[PDB]
Design a binder for this molecule. Structure first.
Ligand SMILES: [Ca+2]
Ligand SMILES: [Ca+2]
Ligand SMILES: [Ca+2]
Lengths: 597, 99
């Protein structure tokens, strides 16, 4: 709004909050008042209804004081980027690569390949008199179309896009609005993953360090994999199908993993969740019945999510009054929208305080985040043990406060991004000391204590001592075990302070043992083999003392999973048969990442 | 048939362009022709010429070597393993998905 004047940034008694009398956005972008993620006034985003005011990135004070992402280079590693879009072009810097054609132009040829362009607009749509306003409208973009339908997702291309090349090395934000859904557990130790983890480490920890931002996934209810869609049928507990620790990349620490929030201020229906979520950011729903993300589309009414042959109930689409060339859409969503929301927030902070490290920025975002949905309840799992003890155990936490006073939930991480408050804290921030990565401590488990009984009376437990005084930032765990029905397992970690974190919630999507039995007649997966998980729950706590891993089999009932063949439309039922034998914990390893206070 | 690649079981020598299925809820994978090898540049270069491979590039102590047409990558990988070298045959495809 042109009536929203700049602030000096020094106004005495300024309310920087989500309900401030001073809450407005400068700018003449005609669609910016429908970008609820910038400022949520209960507007509908061209969908059938609006949400609840205040549920946004709380970035209005950044915008009113000229904090706009200037000098910050962002890489969008995605399906493409229409670099000639009128509301993006001014912010495109040299170095994009089309990994399919080899050109410097990652513009898609496929009308539905609008994802990367939509992502890009959330970050950095140009501040002008057309379209939308980016979160960080002075940030500079490159695009690398790794997710183009004709990209084989080659290692050389991942390296090129994610900081290894001359072109991409000087980005300070790497936006990764993508992930891998799995039905069988993976080790994180493969050479391809090790190589990228090493790159991300080097890129994060250098001068002018780069922040990797990563989508948690959209698998609360359903996952898609290799032309099939899977979801649980029945009336099981409301635990995520995709826990965000299932994709091995999401536990690498260098990735800041984000869940999605809707315009009502609660977890977007589809969002994956887990102990490795760092923050919640804006992703919306679908833009049909309720708000999604108004952003830049592939240009023209022949390309993109806003195109003549792909109608939407979103009112912005095919609308000659509001968007005659169909250059914008109102349906962008997902953790793929939470990711650029966070990339943009990061770019704002970096532009305001260019000397701060990635770990400093994480600290500021965590300590300033809003505790949305404060009363949401833990999700309990009920079963009867072999001794007839009826148990009710926590399968997913609500909000909990750790021993260092940090509020955390697996749904929202440290909470919803509050850019204004992060900037308030940044003005007085003192730099964190260097990152210390403690050596992995491996615990091989033997004898009777290794057993994981069906429907256990208590967890199978294993403990190790960390001797080093360290303030925790994150913990990584690798687990190896045998068990015939993996989703029966609840895996939890306990710190020396007694703080608990569920690393893997049960009834997740690791149904591959059942799928293998049905499809093949034999089972490839014996259990977990160095499966990696991360928790943020312990941020700020002392590492010194005993850490305990707990694993429990919490189900003996049958479960069914619906399998959809996307091509044929054939629906199959997969039955998960209870494990006939007890499982066995083989080993686990603990890595503490933190600093010396 | 079943085939062991990178310590895991797939469904079908392994040559560039060969297609592998990893059960029925996973993307189709393709042998790209590239091998990842954990070795320094000089060691990786010596390993490449003395195994009939082309050194392409490296990062983080891991080299990318490309196999020439006709090369059986599985035979190369098993040999390298026996020599105490960590090796991964690249299996490409649509593993990462837009969220
Ligand atoms: Ca604009
Ligand atoms: Ca369009
Ligand atoms: Ca069981």
């Amino acid at each position: 709004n042109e009536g929203c004047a700049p602030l000096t940034g020094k106004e005495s008694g300024m309310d920087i909050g989500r309900s401030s009398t001073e809450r407005c956005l400068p700018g003449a972008n005609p669609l910016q008042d429908q970008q609820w993620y910038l400022l949520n006034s209960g507007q509908d985003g061209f969908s059938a209804r609006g949400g609840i005011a205040g549920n946004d990135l709380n970035l209005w004070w950044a915008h009113r004081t000229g904090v706009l992402g200037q000098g910050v280079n962002v890489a969008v590693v995605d399906d493409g980027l229409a670099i000639a879009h009128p509301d993006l072009a001014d912010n495109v810097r040299p170095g994009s690569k089309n990994v399919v054609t080899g050109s410097d132009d990652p513009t898609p040829t496929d009308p539905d390949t609008a994802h990367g362009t939509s992502v890009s607009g959330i970050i950095a749509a140009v501040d002008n008199a057309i379209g939308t306003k980016g979160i960080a409208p002075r940030a500079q973009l490159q695009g690398f179309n790794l997710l183009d339908d004709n990209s084989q997702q080659l290692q050389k291309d991942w390296l090129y896009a994610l900081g290894d090349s001359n072109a991409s090395r000087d980005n300070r934000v790497f936006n990764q609005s993508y992930g891998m859904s799995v039905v069988d557990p993976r080790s994180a130790n493969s050479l391809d993953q090790s190589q990228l983890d090493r790159l991300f480490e080097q890129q994060t920890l250098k001068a002018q360090g780069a922040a990797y931002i990563k989508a948690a996934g959209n698998g609360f209810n359903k996952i898609a994999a290799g032309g099939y869609v899977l979801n649980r049928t029945g009336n099981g507990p409301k635990l995520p199908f995709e826990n965000s620790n299932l994709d091995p990349s999401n536990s690498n620490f260098w990735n800041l993993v984000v869940s999605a929030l809707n315009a009502d201020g609660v977890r977007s229906s589809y969002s994956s969740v887990g102990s490795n979520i760092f923050l919640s950011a804006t992703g919306g729903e679908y833009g049909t019945d309720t708000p999604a993300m108004v952003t830049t589309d592939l240009p023209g009414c022949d390309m993109g999510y806003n195109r003549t042959d792909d109608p939407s109930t979103n009112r912005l689409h095919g609308n000659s009054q509001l968007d005659a060339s169909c250059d914008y859409n109102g349906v962008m969503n997902g953790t793929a929208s939470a990711t650029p929301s966070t990339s943009g927030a990061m770019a704002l902070l970096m532009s305001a305080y260019p000397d701060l490290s990635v770990r400093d920025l994480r600290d500021l975002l965590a300590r300033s985040a809003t505790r949305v949905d404060a009363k949401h309840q833990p999700v309990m799992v009920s079963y009867t043990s072999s001794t007839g003890k009826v148990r009710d155990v926590k399968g997913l936490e609500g909000w909990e406060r750790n021993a260092a006073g940090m509020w955390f939930s697996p749904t929202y991480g440290f909470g919803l991004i509050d850019v204004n408050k992060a900037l308030e804290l940044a003005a007085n921030h003192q730099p964190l000391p260097p990152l210390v990565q403690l050596p992995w401590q491996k615990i091989n488990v033997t004898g009777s204590a290794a057993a994981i009984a069906d429907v256990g009376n208590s967890p199978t437990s294993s403990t190790t001592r960390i001797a080093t005084p360290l303030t925790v930032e994150a913990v990584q765990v690798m687990v190896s075990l045998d068990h015939q029905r993996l989703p029966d397992l609840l895996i939890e970690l306990v710190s020396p302070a007694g703080t608990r974190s569920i690393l893997l919630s049960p009834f997740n999507s690791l149904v591959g043992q059942s799928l293998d039995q049905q499809q093949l007649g034999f089972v490839r997966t014996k259990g977990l083999r160095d499966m990696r998980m991360l928790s943020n729950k312990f941020y700020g706590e002392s590492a010194q003392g005993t850490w305990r891993l707990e694993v429990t089999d919490v189900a003996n009932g049958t479960r069914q999973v619906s399998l959809l063949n996307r091509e044929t439309r054939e629906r199959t039922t997969l039955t998960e048969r209870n494990n006939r034998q007890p499982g066995k914990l083989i080993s686990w390893s603990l890595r503490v990442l933190g600093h010396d206070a | 048939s079943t085939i062991e690649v990178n310590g895991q079981t797939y469904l079908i020598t392994l040559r560039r362009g060969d297609v592998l299925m990893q059960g029925a809820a996973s993307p189709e994978l393709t042998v790209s022709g590239t091998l990842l090898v954990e070795a320094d540049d000089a060691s990786a270069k010596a390993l490449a010429t003395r195994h009939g491979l082309n050194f392409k590039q490296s990062s983080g102590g891991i080299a990318l070597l490309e196999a020439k047409p006709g090369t059986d990558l599985n035979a190369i990988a098993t040999k390298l393993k026996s020599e105490g070298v960590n090796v991964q045959i690249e299996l490409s495809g649509a593993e990462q998905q837009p969220k």
